Amino acid sequence: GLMQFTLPVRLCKEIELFHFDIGPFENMWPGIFVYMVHRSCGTSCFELEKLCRFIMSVKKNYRRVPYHNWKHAVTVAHCMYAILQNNHTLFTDLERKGLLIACLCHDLDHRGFSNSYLQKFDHPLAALYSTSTMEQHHFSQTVSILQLEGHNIFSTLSSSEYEQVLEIIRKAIIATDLALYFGNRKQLEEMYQTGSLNLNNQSHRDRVIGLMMTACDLCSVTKLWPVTKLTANDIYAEFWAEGDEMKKLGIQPIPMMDRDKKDEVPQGQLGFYNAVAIPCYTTLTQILPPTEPLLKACRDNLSQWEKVIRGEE
């Protein structure tokens, strides 16, 4: 009960900001995640020994890939933490509990290949799940770890509540399928415009949680420019490896994934900010006004990519 986590002074201050970077010391990331759960949820909501065992099994089941790794998991969870702390009264105790777990687990056992590549490869997972292929794999990896001995962090919930939180976690993990984002943001835009958006309608909540999951997942585009720029190397290292794997199947990859067309990267980023990121953080800010800093930092990075194109860095 009386065993609270502390951070060094700089981290204790900067962890509250949306643009926090968790740093290069892997061995601090678990303690950072627990601190976030304790302040977002209470020191009571999880048994520390089960939580710690859960965290280390989740880490063990992330792979050594350039971008979709353990650091991305904790980074995505930190963005969710920033959102929840800035919208303190909007979310139930179960939602606070579930969403941080969802973010830590959202890319479990990722191998750095898109749903498209699994389909063209004819991967067994694509036969099991025709849509959101990796995302249904990420959720079933989460259930697996929750069912290991000593790992049920939800042990003290009723059958009913346990089922609700696993249902919040499933929808949250599925929503990280960016193919689903486009329609989800379109629907929320319409509902906010006509004033029909209602946070007591469970199907409206689900959509808003869906958009938060996209916002946390893309949060690399909302860091300070030097972090955004270095993370972009990791993202493209996976894209180019997938492009190589397409070429091995006898398929010219889209130019984004072609390491022969690296010259097109800055214009590709410009495309992605205009088509995906800016609309995402725009609609999110309309619904949750305190998330404004995410939109502002996204516009800043858009401006920095325009400077790269115009040869100004």
Ligand SMILES: Cc1cc(NC(=O)c2cc3c(COc4ccccn4)nn(-c4ccccc4)c3s2)n(C(C)(C)C)n1
């Ligand atoms: C339905 C869907 C959607 C997507 N594409 C994507 O998911 C992404 C694209 C990008 C880019 C660059 O985008 C562009 C856009 C057009 C031309 C060149 N490049 N940067 N980041 C990024 C940047 C920062 C942080 C996270 C992600 C992302 S995530 N696919 C594929 C088939 C997997 C590509 N299928």
Ligand SMILES: [Mg+2]
């Ligand atoms: Mg994913």
Ligand SMILES: [Zn+2]
């Ligand atoms: Zn992700």
